[PDB]
RNA sequence: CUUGGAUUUACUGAAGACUAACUACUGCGAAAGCAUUUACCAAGGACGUUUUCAUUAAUCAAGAACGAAAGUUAGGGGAUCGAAGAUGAUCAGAUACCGUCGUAGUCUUAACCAUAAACUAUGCCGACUAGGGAUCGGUUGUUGUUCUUUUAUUGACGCAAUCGGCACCUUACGAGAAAUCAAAGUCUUUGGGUUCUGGGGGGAGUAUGGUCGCAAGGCUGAAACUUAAAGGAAUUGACGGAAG
């Protein structure tokens, strides 16, 4: 609940004591119940396997990638998202990867990732169509819905409130160096208006 | 009326031919319609062979040629006089002019 | 105000023993200072030089070699093979009309882990008794000729080192054998290795490079 | 023997670049263009200014120790014209008559293997 | 005029008539 | 009888929400309510649970998939891409 | 090619369809060939092979699934595995 | 845009398009169209056939599939070009031609759209009528040729036949108003089968109704009124900021 990506319960054996250790992975699209998952440096290049980034060839599609060695997953975790491995620096033991937002990042080749695409993609393609659907969506996430427009408030409640007509009055692009209570609108906006052309 | 039987191009048993840009003005012209000339020229003018040979550090060095295949549209070629307007009967003559 | 040519130091370019005329020429660079050395800023340069200059014989005039410097020894530079290319006029002189151009490439690594792309080009040969205007090979035939080239370029490069390959590329060792193999399918003319490209290099071995310089 | 440089001549239809480098081309010795010799934009590619640029670089070559040059002549290339501009012919001729020694000659005009959409439009530039 | 431009001129006029009928 | 000309499953929304939003929902909602052919047992009994959960009523196999389809187009690209990448490494 | 040989066998020779029929045929030693569909579970497949190994019977792995194997036999249902008891006019046994 | 190093130079790297030369009175496809390699998947024409079935066929209202480019919808990509826009010129004026940027678009994935000088301005099927040389694919017989390999069962080349094609050259028995046409011929000596379209120029592919489309629009589609001409091919002259 609250997550668009399904979760997979995977059971491993404990190497040092007689016990089953249960892990909660983010399920990649194509993973099924009863499938064997291999995690380690010597694991093969298969969907659902957990491999260090250095062990994957360029162009490998991975998900739940670690920012730092041992943080257990930082990048590419939402439904339909993934990480592309751009290149390697074996001499420096680093890996260039491409993040879902389009950013290029340098990560240690010891950092791990799960091969495949996070399941549940295309969720945004369907409209919600109803205030009730958004209500149920945010009922299991947090209290952030619905949102009253600041321009529709009074001057006590918001910097945008007040006036005989609903209008912001001053530029809604706010400095990054502004303080709490001022950062309402477009914070540190490098540009505004409809995005035209490539970025 | 029909000025040419071939309709000014060389498309028969064919639907579409990928166009080319005029060398003079970059105008899109069909490849079989474009006026094409093969050009194999010297790097240096024939007067500039005496002074290049003496300055050469290589004994008996052959000057490489300048290879080009030029493309023209009908407007590019006529203005540059690559082709000229011919009489109604002489239009049919498609054997190359005797120059070389 | 500074006359920037006062602080240039001249160096000497040396070709490997696989090449005959080892005295390529001279290069220049700023003198070595405490902040930046002249040696590290001079290595890695690429020199394009004609094969007739590296061999003396003018028969090799239409092929130029790229040489990559990877060791500096005082005033001398120790270079290595970096690539092969045809002169623009020669490759344009080969492509005439009424004949079929067949070209094949393959990416292959040598025994010493030197990943190369070898580009082979061949043309159909006009028979002495031929009457017809054009000399075209059928598309199925050019596929077999292309298939023969790739399986030979792989066989001749992956079975020898980079230094041994340089001994093959100069006298057209690969080019003459392709012509023999593609003979039974279609007569060919001007079979050439028109391009060699270095993509990946192994862990640096200046000892083996020193073994290539005398 | 000789001190081989490389004279890379750029001969467009608007200017002429005479650029003398080493064998690698990573080090520049002399670079004088047609617009450095004339005051009008129309004759920057003219053969007259081409020899003036070629003579100045030739004097620059001797005073630093260059005695012979390889010639890299090229046109604008790319999607534009492939024939060398008028300035290439006189500048090389002046280089031959300037006391320098000439080595190899090669045309290195960049040629696409297909190409991007050439400027001007479908109907070209109409004059 | 030119035949192509007369066809285009009528299309602009035709769209005007469609918009006017939309009011009623 | 063909009860609806075009709305189909989006006939439950009546006249609300706009034609484009309803016809955008119709494309996705038909896919999410269809029965799919199980790649394991071969029967056509695969139905969606929650998003990304696709269960087979016959063999009790649950496969992770798309929000509204058993497989997204992007995942099929990765299965082939990973497969060819695996081949080169394993020769 | 094996699709053609199998189809002639169904029309001419004797065969049994299904996991239960095949294992009984292997137990009785009447099986000449056992054909297994691609999507047959590995546990059942590895058990069919053990029976076949004990009875010393060749095994052919049909590349399609039980849906494709079923329609090759001219049936309108899914066939997960079959055992050819008497190859008739066809020569499916000689090639495997 | 440039002493804040422009342009140029060499090396390196990434992004997207696109497949130069080879490239042709050449090939494939129902048409639109199709050009790097290899692999996979399913099709197709022609030729070969002393194989097989025996009329299963041609053209077709109604109705379907595909359908350049531009355009629409939603994601991804957006290198270069570039509608719109802005700008520097020229000009009496230019919000045009020329120059510099540039947004949609160009590309791709799911769908719409159904229009082009979508032309061969030439419907499809069939038979006949005149000579000639080339060319592609298949097939059939023959070399002072070159070659595997030393030769055959090699391949290429050469010379002959054919079927199929894309066509080309000459002549006009014949046709046509003529240009021209091996079909635009076998049409007052008027009849092989069949589908579609036109009845002087406009108004007008407009109005209205219907129908399809998200829209842009597509298809069907008048009348009032107005007019003695509009037009085709060729000839002489005149003129041309066309050549000789
Ligand atoms: Zn033009
Ligand atoms: Zn199942």
PDB file of C-alpha atoms (C1' of nucleotides) in Angstrom, chain C residues 46 66 82 92 95-101 103 125 127-134 136 138 141 143 146 180 183-187, chain H residues 10-13 20-25 36-39 134-138 143-149 154-159:
ATOM      1  CA  UNK C  46      49.237  10.947 -32.885  1.00  0.00           C
ATOM      2  CA  UNK C  66      49.058   6.902 -37.559  1.00  0.00           C
ATOM      3  CA  UNK C  82      48.010   3.519 -34.047  1.00  0.00           C
ATOM      4  CA  UNK C  92      38.236   7.973 -54.875  1.00  0.00           C
ATOM      5  CA  UNK C  95      35.436   3.763 -57.208  1.00  0.00           C
ATOM      6  CA  UNK C  96      34.582   3.888 -60.905  1.00  0.00           C
ATOM      7  CA  UNK C  97      31.213   3.315 -62.536  1.00  0.00           C
ATOM      8  CA  UNK C  98      29.804   0.138 -64.107  1.00  0.00           C
ATOM      9  CA  UNK C  99      31.600  -1.951 -61.472  1.00  0.00           C
ATOM     10  CA  UNK C 100      30.534  -3.410 -58.133  1.00  0.00           C
ATOM     11  CA  UNK C 101      31.978  -2.138 -54.851  1.00  0.00           C
ATOM     12  CA  UNK C 103      33.302  -3.735 -48.639  1.00  0.00           C
ATOM     13  CA  UNK C 125      37.376  -7.265 -62.336  1.00  0.00           C
ATOM     14  CA  UNK C 127      37.581  -9.719 -68.141  1.00  0.00           C
ATOM     15  CA  UNK C 128      39.982  -9.116 -71.058  1.00  0.00           C
ATOM     16  CA  UNK C 129      37.517 -10.604 -73.570  1.00  0.00           C
ATOM     17  CA  UNK C 130      34.446  -8.956 -72.024  1.00  0.00           C
ATOM     18  CA  UNK C 131      32.191  -7.011 -74.388  1.00  0.00           C
ATOM     19  CA  UNK C 132      29.377  -5.642 -72.223  1.00  0.00           C
ATOM     20  CA  UNK C 133      29.528  -2.136 -70.789  1.00  0.00           C
ATOM     21  CA  UNK C 134      29.107  -2.954 -67.089  1.00  0.00           C
ATOM     22  CA  UNK C 136      28.224  -6.179 -61.961  1.00  0.00           C
ATOM     23  CA  UNK C 138      24.953 -10.483 -58.270  1.00  0.00           C
ATOM     24  CA  UNK C 141      27.678 -13.275 -54.948  1.00  0.00           C
ATOM     25  CA  UNK C 143      27.410 -11.552 -49.940  1.00  0.00           C
ATOM     26  CA  UNK C 146      31.792 -10.307 -48.080  1.00  0.00           C
ATOM     27  CA  UNK C 180      42.681 -16.042 -54.003  1.00  0.00           C
ATOM     28  CA  UNK C 183      38.499 -16.066 -56.957  1.00  0.00           C
ATOM     29  CA  UNK C 184      36.146 -19.009 -57.544  1.00  0.00           C
ATOM     30  CA  UNK C 185      33.097 -16.818 -56.806  1.00  0.00           C
ATOM     31  CA  UNK C 186      33.943 -13.742 -58.886  1.00  0.00           C
ATOM     32  CA  UNK C 187      37.159 -12.260 -60.313  1.00  0.00           C
TER      33      UNK C 187
ATOM     34  C1'   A H  10      45.160  17.662 -33.302  1.00  0.00           C
ATOM     35  C1'   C H  11      43.309  14.100 -29.674  1.00  0.00           C
ATOM     36  C1'   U H  12      39.155  12.373 -26.939  1.00  0.00           C
ATOM     37  C1'   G H  13      33.905  11.671 -25.948  1.00  0.00           C
ATOM     38  C1'   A H  20      27.692   9.676 -50.063  1.00  0.00           C
ATOM     39  C1'   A H  21      30.889   7.689 -53.962  1.00  0.00           C
ATOM     40  C1'   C H  22      29.284   2.336 -56.189  1.00  0.00           C
ATOM     41  C1'   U H  23      24.052   4.595 -58.585  1.00  0.00           C
ATOM     42  C1'   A H  24      22.476   3.088 -64.228  1.00  0.00           C
ATOM     43  C1'   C H  25      16.925   5.467 -70.084  1.00  0.00           C
ATOM     44  C1'   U H  36      25.438  -0.011 -44.147  1.00  0.00           C
ATOM     45  C1'   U H  37      26.264  -5.422 -42.312  1.00  0.00           C
ATOM     46  C1'   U H  38      24.582  -9.881 -40.398  1.00  0.00           C
ATOM     47  C1'   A H  39      20.768 -13.044 -38.165  1.00  0.00           C
ATOM     48  C1'   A H 134      20.851  -3.446 -76.050  1.00  0.00           C
ATOM     49  C1'   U H 135      19.604  -4.839 -70.707  1.00  0.00           C
ATOM     50  C1'   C H 136      17.819  -7.872 -65.871  1.00  0.00           C
ATOM     51  C1'   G H 137      16.210 -12.954 -63.946  1.00  0.00           C
ATOM     52  C1'   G H 138      15.679 -18.031 -65.145  1.00  0.00           C
ATOM     53  C1'   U H 143      34.897 -20.820 -76.644  1.00  0.00           C
ATOM     54  C1'   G H 144      42.481 -18.444 -79.812  1.00  0.00           C
ATOM     55  C1'   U H 145      38.969 -16.110 -73.177  1.00  0.00           C
ATOM     56  C1'   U H 146      40.539 -15.633 -67.814  1.00  0.00           C
ATOM     57  C1'   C H 147      40.664 -18.516 -63.630  1.00  0.00           C
ATOM     58  C1'   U H 148      40.129 -22.903 -59.113  1.00  0.00           C
ATOM     59  C1'   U H 149      44.713 -25.635 -59.069  1.00  0.00           C
ATOM     60  C1'   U H 154      34.513 -24.037 -60.619  1.00  0.00           C
ATOM     61  C1'   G H 155      33.589 -19.164 -61.536  1.00  0.00           C
ATOM     62  C1'   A H 156      33.715 -15.032 -64.743  1.00  0.00           C
ATOM     63  C1'   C H 157      33.786 -13.788 -69.807  1.00  0.00           C
ATOM     64  C1'   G H 158      32.145 -14.911 -75.250  1.00  0.00           C
ATOM     65  C1'   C H 159      28.772 -16.658 -78.946  1.00  0.00           C
TER      66        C H 159
END
